[PDB]
Ligand binder design. Sequence first.
Ligand SMILES: Nc1ncnc2c1ncn2[C@@H]1O[C@H](COP(=O)(O)OP(=O)(O)OP(=O)(O)O)[C@@H](O)[C@H]1O
Ligand SMILES: Nc1ncnc2c1ncn2[C@@H]1O[C@H](COP(=O)(O)OP(=O)(O)O)[C@@H](O)[C@H]1O
Ligand SMILES: [K+]
Ligand SMILES: [K+]
Ligand SMILES: [K+]
Ligand SMILES: [K+]
Ligand SMILES: [Mg+2]
Ligand SMILES: [Mg+2]
Lengths: 332, 330
Amino acid sequence: KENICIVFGGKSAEHEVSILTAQNVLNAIDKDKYHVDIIYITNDGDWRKQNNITAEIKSTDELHLELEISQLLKESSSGQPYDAVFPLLHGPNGEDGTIQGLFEVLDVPYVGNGVLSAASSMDKLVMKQLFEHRGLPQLPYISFLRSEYEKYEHNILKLVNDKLNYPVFVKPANLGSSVGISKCNNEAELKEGIKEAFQFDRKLVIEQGVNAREIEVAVLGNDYPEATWPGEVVVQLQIPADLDEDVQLTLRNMALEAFKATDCSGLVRADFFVTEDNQIYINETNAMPGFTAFSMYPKLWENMGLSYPELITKLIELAKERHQDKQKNKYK
Amino acid sequence: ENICIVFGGKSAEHEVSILTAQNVLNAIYHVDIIYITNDGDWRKQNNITAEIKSTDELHLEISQLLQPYDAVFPLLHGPNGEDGTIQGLFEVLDVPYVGNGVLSAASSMDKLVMKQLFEHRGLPQLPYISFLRSEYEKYEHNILKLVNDKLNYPVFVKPANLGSSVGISKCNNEAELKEGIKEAFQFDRKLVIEQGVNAREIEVAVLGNDYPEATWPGEVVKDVAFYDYKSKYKDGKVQLQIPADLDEDVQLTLRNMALEAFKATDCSGLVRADFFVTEDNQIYINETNAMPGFTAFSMYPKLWENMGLSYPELITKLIELAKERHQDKQ
Ligand SMILES: Nc1ncnc2c1ncn2[C@@H]1O[C@H](COP(=O)(O)OP(=O)(O)OP(=O)(O)O)[C@@H](O)[C@H]1O
Ligand SMILES: Nc1ncnc2c1ncn2[C@@H]1O[C@H](COP(=O)(O)OP(=O)(O)O)[C@@H](O)[C@H]1O
Ligand SMILES: [K+]
Ligand SMILES: [K+]
Ligand SMILES: [K+]
Ligand SMILES: [K+]
Ligand SMILES: [Mg+2]
Ligand SMILES: [Mg+2]
């Protein structure tokens, strides 16, 4: 058997769905193939651990678990070091690169994106700037800092009025999912949206609004990633999405380009806007997308013939490969 | 107030981090130090009341190693310290720290991401190419032909995430380029190859959080063209000049470029911007460094001394910026 550790919970608003995700992942892992330990991070930051999961998780209640951090991750309960650590955290303090940096300092192998890819895909501005260098189409947008807005509010609003068309969307640069995002139908709502998002962040983006369908593509791999056929979020899903053949192939190639633009590893989900006349814009990539048994990312791969337990195993094997390829770097 | 100095690191710049730590300790508070060996082992020594006489005497649970400290001051160079990794550990433990955050340290260490962000900011750069080890094995031929068609010999092959000129080689033709690529791949999975330029090498120091300030530029006056590892730390044939012999408008251009490069990676605390200036007065930016060296051969402290900010004041100012940034997070 191989030794795996699941990390879930976290100082997050999505604390409960991370626990729900852990139940689906734990119940999908073949216990005869993997020795499984779990680490539960409470809403206060305390780390708690339970050893050797051998039965099915019957309720999300029993995953609420009620030693130092380096000791919990260093050794499996079998005594050996873990072969892979699978974090299932969402939002800030989870997919922002911090816990990945902790994994790197402690030299533990882990599933998913690394420090650079997680942090660059989290920051809305950096994400768009790397997409633009790659040549990916994006909606017109403006960005500025809180310091600049305190002094140049008049000039910033004049640029928005000229370059963009209403409605517009105001988004904080480094916050959680749908946290501080406001659709603004006039300039009065625009200024109120800027004040709301600056109350918790120092950097802002303002996007041109678009009338389009939301199409998503799932990517899996390290150095030779593969993309799925696209799906749509009608939350109800439609897999595969009803698209023209040339749009389906364009989106799969763009998802591979977005994966490379942020130097991703393991997985990513590329979300697009597709209008009625087949105009394509990339919205964002998700370093740790929804991973429940009914989420879009696993269902997109099920349509490709990859089952949920096989997807979990493939991500673990990618974690081992990325760790091995890191050791062959010289550091002396 | 209690400060903790972290130095060493699992990095090819290990010895440089030790030399940087000696001067920061000798010029700086209740001071504790943590020595990370070249293999990644943490070793702590409490209370440095006396003066550090040699680099040799600095060859000495992580959560318990970190009254709690008012600020932790990392002096790590290169991977596993200057690339966002140890900054993420500080974030999880909710401990204030000096310098750049997770994203800023990571995006400035990776020279490819750095160049792409500098390009979007509008900064001038030399023509370059980048590729992964996986791509070079399946596409070696057209990659070497892309160097011939897009770049111009001589070229400089570099690992993406390193410093102190480790892994860099100047290649005058395709035969030397193929050896430089094989050598650079020993340090990283990703490379950058730049068109070479004949130019003077100028550096500018930046300091601050939401309102950074930049110094006057200085020049690395040298006889050799390649400022390699031996030229940087092994012998004193190279002389620094602060400020540099440049026109007033050229010096002001370099300050404004350093501020834009600081903001291009959303820097916090400090950064050092390095430039190339040709004989016909053309300007390219080379790189920025999230934690520049503080060795006797370094320039970041000397650049701020010329501004009237002495060495002990520079250390204190960096600690204040760390406490300010931490309070804004909480
Ligand atoms: N395109 C180029 N043209 C001419 N010289 C170059 C070029 N690229 C690199 N060099 C030489 O290599 C040296 C190091 O370059 P670079 O800044 O890329 O490496 P580094 O290790 O990041 O530097 P540092 O030690 O400051 O971190 C420079 O001082 C310069 O002399
Ligand atoms: N420019 C836009 N035009 C139309 N709808 C948008 C635009 N930007 C965001 N939205 C809507 O807002 C939702 C959240 O936007 P997104 O940037 O994905 O937030 P997050 O990254 O926090 O999930 C999306 O599902 C989308 O439907
Ligand atoms: K994102
Ligand atoms: K750098
Ligand atoms: K030539
Ligand atoms: K340099
Ligand atoms: Mg979204
Ligand atoms: Mg450097």
